[PDB]
Design a protein around this ligand. Structure first.
Ligand SMILES: *[C@@H]1O[C@H](CO[C@@H]2O[C@@H](C)[C@@H](O)[C@@H](O)[C@@H]2O)[C@@H](O)[C@H](O)[C@H]1NC(C)=O
Ligand SMILES: *[C@@H]1O[C@H](CO)[C@@H](O)[C@H](O)[C@H]1NC(C)=O
Ligand SMILES: [Cl-]
Length: 234
């Protein structure tokens, strides 16, 4: 996260860390005790057996007593996920057990089934353990930035017409670069206490307004998300 601040330890109990080969690789959120929502691009060319989901974390390099580590029993990539364009960049993680919900491990609500995406100017927050600068500097813990939803046409223009109808954009509230960075992928964009976005892709320079922050528009996937959950439920 660039242009953000370190959250109070465990103040966002919904945050997940997807680890590959012991290292943090992506973010995500706890939808249900055993369900994690993330970005499909995070698992592209990766052995699911080397994957771990950590919940209840603040400092990833610390074996925190609030941390709960789970394996991935199933990965469900969106059927229409196109890696080149980043279209339908969403996936669901069914863990090899259920998280014990507490003050450090919680759930995040999806937008409604009949809910529209937020309008330009809507204040949102993005969190993660991704880089804090363009010099691959690591955060002291789970960071969070204050962003504002950016007009879809202004964004699509900046992106040379490469945005899909199911993608939203953010900008900073001021003159400082604020947004996500490498390894914040999959982690949610929280608008009005709902996961409206999902970290997808940026430019070369983290938080650069010339190459705005692209998130997966979550409201479009609410129906799919519950369909996949129900399918593997008793
Ligand atoms: C995004 O915009 C696309 C059109 O972009 C414009 O036209 C193309 C041919 C290029 O000249 C480009 O530089 C221009 O910005 C649309 O095809 C597409 O539907 C738009 N997507 C959304 C979500 O509105
Ligand atoms: C869950 O998965 C992890 C990683 O594969 C493994 O270490 C752990 O033993 C598993 N737990 C159960 C109950 O299967
Ligand atoms: Cl569940």
């Amino acid at each position: 996260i660039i242009g953000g601040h370190e959250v109070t330890p465990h103040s966002r109990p919904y945050m997940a860390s997807v680890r590959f080969g012991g290292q943090h690789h992506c973010g995500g959120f706890l939808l249900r005790a055993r369900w994690v929502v993330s970005a499909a691009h995070c698992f592209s060319h990766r052995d699911l057996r080397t994957g771990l989901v950590v919940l209840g974390a603040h400092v990833l390099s610390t074996a925190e007593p609030t941390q709960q580590v789970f394996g991935i029993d199933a990965l469900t990539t969106h059927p229409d996920y196109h890696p080149m364009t980043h279209a339908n960049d969403i996936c669901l993680l069914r863990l090899n057990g259920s998280a014990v919900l507490g003050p450090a491990v919680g759930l995040l609500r999806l937008p409604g089934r009949r809910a529209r995406p937020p309008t330009a100017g809507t204040r949102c927050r993005v969190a993660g353990w991704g880089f804090v600068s363009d010099f691959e500097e690591l955060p002291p813990g789970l960071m969070e930035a204050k962003v504002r939803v950016l007009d879809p046409d202004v964004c699509n223009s900046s992106w040379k017409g490469h945005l899909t109808l199911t993608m939203l954009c953010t900008r900073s509230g001021d003159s400082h670069r604020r947004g996500f960075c490498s390894a914040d992928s999959g982690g949610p964009l929280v608008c009005r206490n709902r996961a409206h976005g999902l970290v997808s892709f940026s430019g070369l320079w983290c938080g650069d307004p010339k190459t705005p922050d692209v998130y997966t528009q979550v409201s479009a996937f609410v129906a799919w998300i519950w369909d996949v959950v129900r399918r593997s439920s008793p």
